[PDB]
Design a protein around this ligand. Structure first.
Ligand SMILES: */C=C/C1=C(C)C(=O)N/C1=C\C1=NC(=C\c2[nH]c(/C=C3\NC(=O)C(C=C)=C3C)c(C)c2CCC(=O)O)/C(CCC(=O)O)=C1C
Length: 483
């Protein structure tokens, strides 16, 4: 019965809302096919009253439907299927699935004049051609963002990248003129709490037909079998958190639809479609996106590792240049401090320090004091050959490696505090009408929430950055020992 406030919202059970969106009806069955619960609108949408204890009957739901249901009813492992069928006055999409051991049948009115197979195929071809045309991982995102809008007619579609700390960044955008831009927006991991994030990962597509909707409750609330709520995780019609709904209306959005990009076990980022008026996307089309989601995820994965590959390649090429120079010139300092192949170019940094013997070369600033303090901190830890941190002198980020012990051969890279890369301003943008929860649920409030998180922090060191440092360290050890 608990109200969901700003304090609660992190722990909101959004998977068991026990209600569904109004653009469809829902019937929940148990293993034997016996009805356990239904949305309060089954009668109003489909001509009949589903009742707990009942079993579904032909042409109160039609034949092919039970035909489908029986197949999944007798199959081990998460059944999933859909049928198209006429029930009374209308034809329906009857998407059905089984999660836990409860079976779900979802009913959407089908208004499309097209054959489903071809509608599905047509859109799949169109939206994944965008995945064959681009080598830049960012062109991919940018282009499919522009294309998703062309296909769906959404007012605004955005592409979101998720950082290491699960903070988001709007990296692409295609929007109707009128609308303010959110390009370069940054938001915290708290604006998509655990359960919501778990769900985007498990579900390629989420659709919100109308944010201003009144939910259609499924009765009864609790599954008699367990005396605990129905887990609508894989339910297409599952209802929305009032918090998110308030957020979206603060923005002035009325319909959403998001396509996930999952790589590893991580939500790599999603495409979020917004509309200013309510909007619906037919089932077969959503399936076009679902399959797309899986392929795009695959290509983004490769494109990303193709990116790291090239980073490693030019790094070694520079380690080669470095090895070449060092042996022939015989001062390392000159080699390391080289403007372009220098260490400052090896790994993205705002500065670097080279330190062998008693001599100190600070390149791109005065870093001698910091390096001294960092080194003192490592006093307590004589065995550390590598040190790094984004919390901390005057530079937040530090990556230090040791290549000579006795003569204190050290290398440092430094990073300043992370800064909002792109920022809007210039003319006060319009007044958002703000709900009861407060300004926290506006983009402006989200950004501020993000600042408070990152400030005091430099950008984390790449998986890649550390790998390079490690290779460099090996190089110099080799050199110093060798000659
Ligand atoms: C304390 C919990 C929450 C706060 C605070 C909050 O702002 N939202 C909270 C719960 C949920 N967030 C959900 C998803 C979600 N998060 C955002 C935030 C942004 N997206 C942007 O593009 C920008 C700025 C450019 C921001 C600030 C959005 C838009 C969404 C909706 C996802 C979508 O549009 O597809 C979320 C999911 C709820 C659901 O739809 O089930 C919850 C519960």
């Amino acid at each position: 019965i608990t109200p969901v406030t700003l304090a609660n919202c992190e722990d909101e059970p959004i998977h068991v809302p026990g209600a569904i969106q109004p653009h469809g009806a829902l019937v929940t069955l148990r293993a034997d096919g016996m009805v356990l619960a239904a949305s309060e609108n089954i009668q109003a949408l489909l001509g009949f009253v589903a009742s707990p204890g009942s079993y579904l009957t032909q042409e109160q739901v039609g034949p092919e439907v039970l035909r489908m249901l029986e197949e999944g009813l007798t199959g081990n492992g998460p059944w999933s299927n859909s049928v198209e069928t006429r029930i009374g006055e209308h034809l329906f999409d009857v998407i059905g699935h089984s999660y836990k051991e409860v079976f779900y049948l979802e009913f959407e009115i089908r208004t499309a004049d097209t054959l489903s197979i071809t509608s599905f195929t047509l859109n799949a071809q169109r939206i994944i051609a965008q995945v064959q045309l681009h080598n830049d991982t960012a062109s991919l995102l940018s282009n499919v963002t522009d294309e998703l809008r062309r296909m769906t007619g959404y007012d605004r579609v955005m592409a979101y990248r998720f950082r290491h700390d699960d903070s988001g960044e709007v990296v692409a955008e295609s929007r109707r003129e009128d609308l303010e831009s959110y390009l370069g927006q940054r938001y915290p991991a708290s604006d998509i709490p655990a359960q919501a994030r778990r769900l985007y990962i498990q579900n390629p597509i989420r659709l919100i037909a109308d944010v201003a909707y009144t939910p259609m409750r499924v009765f009864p609330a609790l599954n008699p079998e367990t005396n605990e709520s129905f887990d609508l995780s894989y339910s297409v019609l599952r209802s929305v958190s009032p918090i998110h709904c308030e957020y979206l209306t603060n923005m002035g959005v009325r319909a959403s639809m998001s396509i996930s990009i999952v790589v590893g076990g991580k939500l790599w980022g999603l495409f979020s479609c917004h509309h200013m008026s309510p909007k619906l996307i037919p089932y077969p089309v959503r399936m076009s996106f679902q399959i797309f989601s899986q392929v795009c995820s695959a290509i983004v994965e490769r494109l990303e590792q193709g990116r790291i590959a090239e980073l490693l390649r030019v790094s070694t090429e520079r380690r080669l240049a470095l090895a070449r120079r060092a042996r022939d010139a015989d001062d390392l300092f000159g080699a390391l401090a080289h403007p372009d192949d220098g260490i400052a170019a090896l790994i993205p940094c705002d500065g670097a320090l080279v330190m062998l013997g008693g001599r100190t070369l600070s390149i791109r600033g005065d870093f001698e004091r910091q390096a001294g303090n960092v080194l003192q901190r490592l006093q307590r830890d004589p065995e550390r050959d590598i040190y790094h941190t984004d919390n901390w002198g005057d530079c937040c980020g530090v990556l230090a490696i040791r290549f000579h012990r006795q003569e204190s051969g050290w290398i440092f890279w430094f990073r300043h505090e992370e800064v909002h890369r792109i920022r809007w301003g210039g003319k006060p943008e319009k007044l958002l009408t703000i709900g009861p929860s407060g300004p926290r649920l506006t983009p402006r409030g989200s950004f501020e929430a993000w600042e408070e998180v990152v400030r005091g922090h430099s950008t984390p060191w790449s998986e890649t950055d550390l790998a390079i440092a490690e290779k460099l360290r090996l190089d110099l050890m080799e050199l110093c020992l060798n000659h």
